[PDB]
Amino acid sequence: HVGTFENITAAPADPILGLADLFRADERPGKINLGIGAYIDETGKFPVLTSVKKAEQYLLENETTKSYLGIDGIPEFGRCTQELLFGKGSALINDKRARTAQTPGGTGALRVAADFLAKNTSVKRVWVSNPSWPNHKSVFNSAGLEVREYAYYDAENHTLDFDALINSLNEAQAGDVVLFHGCCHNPTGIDPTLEQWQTLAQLSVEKGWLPLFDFAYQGFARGLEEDAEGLRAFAAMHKELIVASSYSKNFGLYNERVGACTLVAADSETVDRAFSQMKAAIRANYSNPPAHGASVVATILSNDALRAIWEQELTDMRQRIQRMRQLFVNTLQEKGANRDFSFIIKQNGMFSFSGLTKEQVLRLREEFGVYAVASGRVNVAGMTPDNMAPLCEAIVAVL
Amino acid sequence: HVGTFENITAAPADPILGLADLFRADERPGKINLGIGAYIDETGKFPVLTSVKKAEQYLLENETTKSYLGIDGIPEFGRCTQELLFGKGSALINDKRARTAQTPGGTGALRVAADFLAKNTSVKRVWVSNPSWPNHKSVFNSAGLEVREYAYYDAENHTLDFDALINSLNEAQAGDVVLFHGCCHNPTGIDPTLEQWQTLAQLSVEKGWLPLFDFAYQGFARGLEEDAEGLRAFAAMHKELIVASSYSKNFGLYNERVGACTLVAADSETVDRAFSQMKAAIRANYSNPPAHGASVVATILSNDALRAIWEQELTDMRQRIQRMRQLFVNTLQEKGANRDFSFIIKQNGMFSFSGLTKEQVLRLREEFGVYAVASGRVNVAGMTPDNMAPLCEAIVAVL
Ligand SMILES: *Cc1c(COP(=O)(O)O)cnc(C)c1O
Ligand SMILES: *Cc1c(COP(=O)(O)O)cnc(C)c1O
């Protein structure tokens, strides 16, 4: 009998997560990792937050069971999630229009949404930005959903091409999903203004789209509440929406797989009925979600003192990234770049969408041991005072 | 615009995990939880193992990052998993024929395996025993695979009907998946003997089946090595197989979501090609797996002294369950059951597949606050010296 695996086609390594192994294997002295979006401190450590360590110490001392969570996870984690997303005292919360499942990361939340929609609704098409995080298409395609692209970035002026965005969504139909990044658009770092979010919310209602927000960076653009303004503008008028949120970056809990899928419907009866099918989709995937990271988040968000410690740590990360963004632009100039990189200062979040080409990114790896994503996305949150001059010399060398 | 969620049909609660909510809500102080397969201690707590607490205390004091694991998880976890499954020094390991991905539980490993097969092979169907764990059908169907049943249990005589099993599997075609429970068949507790496993392995090779092992209870039948004899009989002569294993029960790590998907192929080239697509399927599901529980497992298994503490705790659980199984049969007779319940002694694992009908299980809940699964499956590992008399009085009253 011919093996079942004989006809398999190899898949390439992931263009983002595969960079870790490539970086590790490189033997060039002075290599620099700017790939996966993870926060580094000034010393080059990707740290555990102090608030997280304190929560983990509390759990070690107080947990007396590991019994399965419910399919939707820890109830306090869901309550705190809805407050972060919508605001305490939101009508969505008071009217019991939203239900939240704790999931294994924001990716898990996107997947649970995809499987839920594919099995239980008439959704067949999801619109994502050009460019976007590459795993969006993979997640929705896994469920058999068609993924189209809408225009988003003006690569010439390094701004949002809002007129092309509007034009390109003209053919998005009622009952199609349109996916928006809540803040810190990945990879461009360019987000709608509040006025643009309000225009998009109105258009979405008029055209009957189902909005899906990917919210992986709440707190990294301007602050927790400011970064939710776009989502909240959508929440103010829509009957239905979905939010896939992540605590990987804003709590530094990447490998503990901490996210949430929040389903909003017109009323409590409808959301509860829909959520019962979301739970069935979870049960048939990974059964129930991992407790450790979500329990850390719930422990921090439900305790005023620990929460204040965490929100200061998040503000401190944002401040350091902003300082690196400015130092990067200045050092590129110092080291002889003639391209104007001032547009990088306007980008929000952890990255610089640099305009470097695929060929330049590959040269930076092969000739200089500097690792970025082939889309030109560079992790500013991985830069330090000690690595800045060599990384900028390398970039100037490939321009 | 009519809402996308307006016409969704509600899903029922899960027949196993839904018992957690029903039990927790019941106000009667005498309620007894015999539902989900979790181990209780004599004080009535579902505990954290001492080895696990020790490992968690080490992780708390020594972890310096939460950076993403690889898509396939912690390397030492995969090594230790292959050794448990196949034996240190197995030819499968020496010949580099096996690749392991850490997953969010055994369920996550089943779904990853099913998505991998549906999307990269000609597999269309999985053969599952009658009866089996109810979530098997849901996992496989959610990945797009048809599920067919093969004969297994003789419910009137409470035994494995091996001739009926082999006869029904003649309908399985080359390139179909056949699911086997590695040990502690859920729900019946009846496993093939070693000779029967060897017979099944030879037939599977001759017929071209792709074996998938669900191995959630290694250590709960007879012991770690003995419980893997059936899997190892398959590993001796198969070109290809898949193992979905779980550490939820044998480490008591239920809510940390700790399992593995292991692929075996004819040679290193083939298994590495296949595994590249398994990684792609993971990436598009939950991205990468949760570190905390798997870190605990790797810490325990890779330290000789801590491993010995854990293996004694696992033996102590298995022995207490055996004592409860023997006490349950006697107590049923003292409480007035006339019928033969000796078949319960022959069952391996956490459960007793009791022969109670759906109506009897519902009466147990409603009238006595005793919670079992509607199939008649009862969690012997939830029995204690203190709850045995009331649970047996309730059972006799509904017979
Ligand atoms: C970080 C990221 C994610 C996924 O996050 P996880 O929590 O690691 O699964 C999802 N979407 C975007 C846009 C991201 O940047
Ligand atoms: C325990 C169980 C599972 C699920 O295990 P998790 O690790 O919690 O996902 C899978 N299969 C069987 C047969 C089980 O009993």
Author numbering:
A (entry chain A), B (entry chain B): -2 to 396
Question: Could you share sentences copied from the article?
Answer:
During its catalytic cycle, AAT undergoes hinge movement to switch between an open conformation, in the ligand-free form, and a closed conformation upon association with substrates or inhibitors. Using our approach, we enrich the less populated but catalytically active closed conformation in order to increase catalytic efficiency (kcat/KM) with the non-native substrate l-phenylalanine, leading to altered substrate selectivity.
All six enzymes yielded crystals under similar conditions, which could only be obtained in the presence of maleate, an inhibitor that stabilizes the closed conformation when bound by both WT25 and HEX14. In the inhibitor-bound state, all structures were closed as expected due to electrostatic interactions between maleate and the side chains of Arg280 and Arg374. Overlay of AAT structures (Chain A) in the presence and absence of maleate show transition from open to closed states upon inhibitor binding for WT, VFCS, and AIFS, but not for HEX, VFIT, and VFIY, which already adopt the closed conformation in the absence of bound inhibitor. Interestingly, the amplitude of the open/closed conformational transition that occurs in open variants upon maleate binding correlated with their computed ΔE values (VFCS < WT < AIFS), suggesting that this metric can be used to fine-tune this enzyme conformational landscape. Furthermore, DynDom analyses of all variants confirmed that only WT, VFCS, and AIFS undergo hinge motion upon maleate binding, which rotates the moving domain relative to the fixed domain by 4.6, 2.6, and 5.9 degrees, respectively. OpenLow mutants had lower KM values and were more catalytically efficient than WT with both l-phenylalanine and l-aspartate, which could be due to the fact that these mutants have ΔE values similar to the WT but stabilize both the open and closed conformations by >10 kcal mol‒1.
